[PDB]
């Protein structure tokens, strides 16, 4: 009954993702949940800033940062390459179910729907949406999200790919120095066709 989720847990104790390649250690919490809904997978992603370099972004007008998830042939997470450094797992209450994942492949984007290195179908690999940032003054600041599915595989061990880029390009930064506390993106839910189990 719980094998239909594959997520990162709720509010991990420590950072589990390195989004900024400049940071020396994990600089944010990436909360990613994947749910099997028939032939589709519902993906529920957002980020909580932990490091100061990551939180200072709200003081700038043009910001962009990407989380890259690479999965091997069986759908396990490649922590040596991915932004997320903690392997995904099933739901055990409000935590990750410590145990072996045997049906990870079912949660991965379909290579049929989102092919690799196929220029003719390149446009099929893109998804778009908008999340929000709640300012210290209660205003909703929109953040564009671009998701790229299995379109490129740099490392030979990569069989599936998911890149989620949060970017905003406005005229006034959401925060000023003395007001910026943390960067929390409103949850983004996107659907993608899933690979056969």
């Amino acid at each position: 009954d719980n094998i239909n989720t594959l997520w990162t847990g709720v509010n991990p104790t420590e950072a589990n993702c390195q989004i900024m390649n400049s940071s020396e250690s994990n600089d944010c919490k990436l909360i990613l949940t994947l749910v099997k809904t028939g032939a589709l997978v519902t993906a529920f992603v957002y980020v909580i800033g932990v490091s100061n370099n990551f939180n200072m972004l709200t003081t700038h007008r043009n910001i962009n940062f990407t989380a890259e998830l690479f999965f091997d042939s069986t759908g396990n997470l490649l922590t040596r390459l991915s932004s997320l450094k903690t392997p995904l797992n099933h739901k055990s209450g409000q935590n990750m179910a410590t145990g072996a994942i045997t049906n990870a492949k079912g949660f991965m984007p379909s290579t049929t729907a989102y092919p690799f290195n196929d220029n003719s179908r390149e446009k099929e690999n893109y998804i778009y949406g908008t999340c929000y940032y709640t300012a210290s003054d209660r205003t909703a600041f929109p953040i564009d999200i671009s998701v790229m599915l299995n379109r490129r595989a740099i490392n030979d061990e990569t069989s599936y790919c998911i890149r989620i880029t949060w970017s905003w390009n406005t005229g006034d930064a959401p925060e000023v120095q003395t007001s910026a506390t943390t960067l929390v993106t409103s949850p983004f839910t996107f659907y993608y066709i899933r690979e056969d189990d």
């Binding site: 390649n21 400049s22 962009n64 940062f65 990407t66 880029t165 390009n169």
Partner: protein, 202 residues
């Protein structure tokens, strides 16, 4: 170091972790100093010496170039990074009172000038204005050229006119740069027509 002054470039609006350049020395690298030193738009990998971009996206319109003073440890060197321009600023028609006049029975005349402002790099295809006739010139009477020395729309008439006819020569035009708009502003471009009135001289 292999060169007292290195020189590289990186495109405006480039994504995170775009390899701006690589600092070579004959080793631990480090940015001794920056100029203007704000925002923090570049990152220097101390192990390999490669300067990449960061999450704080660049804007040529805010800073045209950056100077970095770097060091190698086991001397100081200069690194000049030029920000290449992209067409991410839509033209704005400065003047609103655009009322030209045509002399009766004249051809090859300069009806008026349309002032245009573009924040992009001066002298580039990202800054020259390209004019097209949204309406009012279906009969092929007026001609608009782009004066690149000032980025102005020279509006000239080539066809005759009879004052007694009082033909409605007013027309509405739209403005875009010579080069195609950058991907960040396309789908936001909205070419609102700018009217110009053509008065017929008595």
């Amino acid at each position: 170091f292999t060169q007292d002054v290195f020189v590289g470039s990186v495109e405006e609006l480039s994504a995170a972790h775009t390899l701006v350049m690589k600092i070579n020395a004959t080793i631990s690298y480090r940015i001794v100093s920056l100029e203007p030193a704000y925002p923090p738009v570049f990152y220097l990998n101390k192990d390999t010496g490669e300067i990449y971009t960061t999450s704080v996206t660049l804007d040529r319109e805010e800073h045209s170039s950056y100077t970095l003073t770097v060091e190698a440890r086991d001397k100081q060197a200069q690194v000049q990074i030029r920000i290449l321009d992209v067409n991410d600023n839509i033209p704005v028609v400065e003047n609103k009172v655009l009322e030209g006049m045509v002399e009766e029975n004249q051809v090859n005349v300069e009806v008026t000038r349309i002032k245009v402002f573009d924040a992009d790099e001066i002298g580039s295809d990202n800054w020259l204005a390209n004019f097209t006739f949204a309406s009012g010139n279906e009969g092929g009477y007026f001609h608009i050229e782009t004066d690149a020395q000032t980025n102005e729309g020279i509006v000239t008439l080539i066809k005759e006119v009879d004052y007694e006819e009082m033909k409605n020569l007013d027309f509405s035009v739209i403005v875009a740069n010579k080069a195609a708009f950058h991907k960040s502003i396309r789908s936001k471009y909205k070419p609102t027509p700018i009217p110009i009135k053509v008065k017929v001289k008595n």
